[PDB]
């Protein structure tokens, strides 16, 4: 536990670099936030899909190269690796705020919606939404708690530097 | 905006004390986390109800005075004010972690549950649960993002002290 590289070599978690750390003021720390992003790529991409939705609602909004189609997840796996490559706590703050703005919006929509076959397919719609919003919210609830945990570790390290 | 007390006095948000701030290492900051707790007492108490549930599952677990009944929210409004009176980021971390442990558990239960009148009332049960878990999760998603925001402000202030 204190000498983990010895442990493995007898009886990834020591790899240090941009995809496994965050920093504030060039004070780096091994990042739970990132480690969650590493074990939950599908859910990560889900929050990345919400990040895109959050920018459009606010009104904010290339280099595809191929003249033949390829994969529809291609774009979202590209962004996925730019997120993980990002160590700045200040940039990561932006990301999670935009994403939360989308979660609140989808929820405002559902709540609003709660207050023939069109209707039967319009109910089924909102029910898929609520299903996704659950998953994203537990993904968000878990991701940012880890991000919050990381900061309590950067708060400690700064005071000791 | 820069002189808000003048503004109000012509054309609560400057009150400084334990219920409106958090600190790390006696470095205080005006707290979004707290301000959310101030505008969402019902939802706050909901997360406090989950805090209690989170301790029991882990196995962790008085002074009621009255020999006549009173109110069933009495206990949870007492804890509500101990939370708001708490400025330590390190204590607040505990609280939100315990609460997240409960959210994950309720979700593990629902997922598990997805894989006569007893059954009809047992389905209705899990559906109320999912309804609450939504509300708590958006309450949690919003509360901790604000807590995370607070830390980005404590990270800044420390480096300037």
């Amino acid at each position: 536990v204190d000498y983990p590289n010895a442990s493995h070599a007898g009886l990834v978690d020591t790899a240090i670099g941009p995809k496994t750390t965050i920093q504030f003021d060039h004070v780096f720390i091994k990042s739970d936030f990132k480690t969650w992003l590493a074990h939950n790529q599908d859910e990560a991409i889900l929050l990345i899909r919400l990040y895109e939705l959050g920018l459009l609602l606010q009104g904010r909004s290339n280099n595809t190269t191929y003249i033949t189609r390829t994969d529809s997840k291609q774009p979202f796996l590209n962004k996925y690796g730019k997120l993980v490559d990002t160590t700045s706590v200040t940039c990561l703050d932006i990301f999670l705020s935009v994403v939360l703005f989308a979660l609140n919006q989808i929820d405002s929509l559902i709540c609003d919606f709660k207050n023939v076959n069109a209707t039967l397919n319009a109910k089924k719609t909102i029910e898929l939404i609520t299903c996704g919003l659950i998953r994203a919210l537990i993904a968000y609830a878990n991701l940012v708690t880890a991000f919050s945990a990381d900061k309590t570790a950067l708060l400690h390290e700064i005071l000791l530097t």
Side-chain angles (χ1 to χ4, degrees), chain A residues 41-51 132 135-137 139:
Chain A
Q41 158 186 131
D42 267 43
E43 323 210 328
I45 291 165
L46 168 52
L47 302 177
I48 286 160
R49 288 195 118 110
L50 295 183
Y51 178 81
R135 297 340 291 169
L137 268 173

Side-chain angles (χ1 to χ4, degrees), chain A residues 65-113:
Chain A
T65 316
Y66 311 135
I67 75 184
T68 89
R69 213 146 163 291
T70 56
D71 181 22
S72 160
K73 181 149 138 183
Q74 245 289 73
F76 301 98
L77 267 162
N78 265 328
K79 296 144 154 157
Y80 166 73
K82 279 191 90 168
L83 165 72
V84 175
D85 266 15
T86 300
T87 64
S88 168
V89 153
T90 307
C91 235
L92 291 178
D93 272 341
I94 309 324
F95 170 73
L96 294 175
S97 93
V98 153
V99 163
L100 181 66
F101 170 82
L103 300 159
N104 290 336
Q105 275 280 289
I106 283 82
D107 184 66
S108 169
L109 159 84
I110 297 149
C111 288
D112 289 346
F113 187 90

Side-chain angles (χ1 to χ4, degrees), chain A residues 51-66:
Chain A
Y51 178 81
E52 173 149 313
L53 174 52
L55 286 168
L56 311 159
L57 301 165
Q58 313 180 202
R60 324 210 315 151
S61 25
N62 32 66
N63 285 15
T64 321
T65 316
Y66 311 135

